[PDB]
Amino acid sequence: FLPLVHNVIKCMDKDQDLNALKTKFQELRKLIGTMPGIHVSPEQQQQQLHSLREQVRTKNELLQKYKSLCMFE
């Protein structure tokens, strides 16, 4: 990316918009991450995701235990 542009600039000035392009790429990547969930620290996000998955699994297990083995009939 930057190497080809640097080589082109060196061949031109042997006797472009890389900064703005990198800024736009970083802005797009940050927007896509915040849309996906990359807005806070990675370890904290992973811990929160693991906790949410554990809570969902516990809720599903509780529902299966309370629904399958019905006490009344």
Binding site: L2, H6, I9, K10, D13, L18, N19, K22, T23, Q26, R29, K30, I32, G33, T34, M35, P36, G37, I38, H39, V40, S41, P42, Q45, Q46, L49, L52, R53, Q55, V56, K59, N60, L62, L63
Partner: protein
């Protein structure tokens, strides 16, 4: 952490711009540090993109599952 990745990428870009300006005004360690920073920024961006995709998938799946379970329970 989009903030840290954006900061690393901006620092690498600034170092590259300074090195390019110095080379243009002239006719080392700075270029090596700039290249190391750019490589680290690219690796961190790839890792963060993979983690963001995984987190989005997990968040959508857990949201759907928890919504279904909570609606049934309620």
């Amino acid at each position: 952490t989009r903030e840290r990745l954006l900061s690393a990428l901006e620092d690498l870009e600034v170092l590259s711009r300074e090195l390019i300006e110095m080379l243009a005004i002239s006719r080392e360690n700075q270029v090596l540090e700039l290249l190391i920073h750019r490589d680290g920024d690219f690796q961190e961006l790839m890792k963060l993109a993979l983690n963001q995709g995984k987190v989005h998938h997990e968040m959508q799946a857990l949201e759907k599952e928890v919504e279904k379970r909570d609606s049934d329970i309620q």
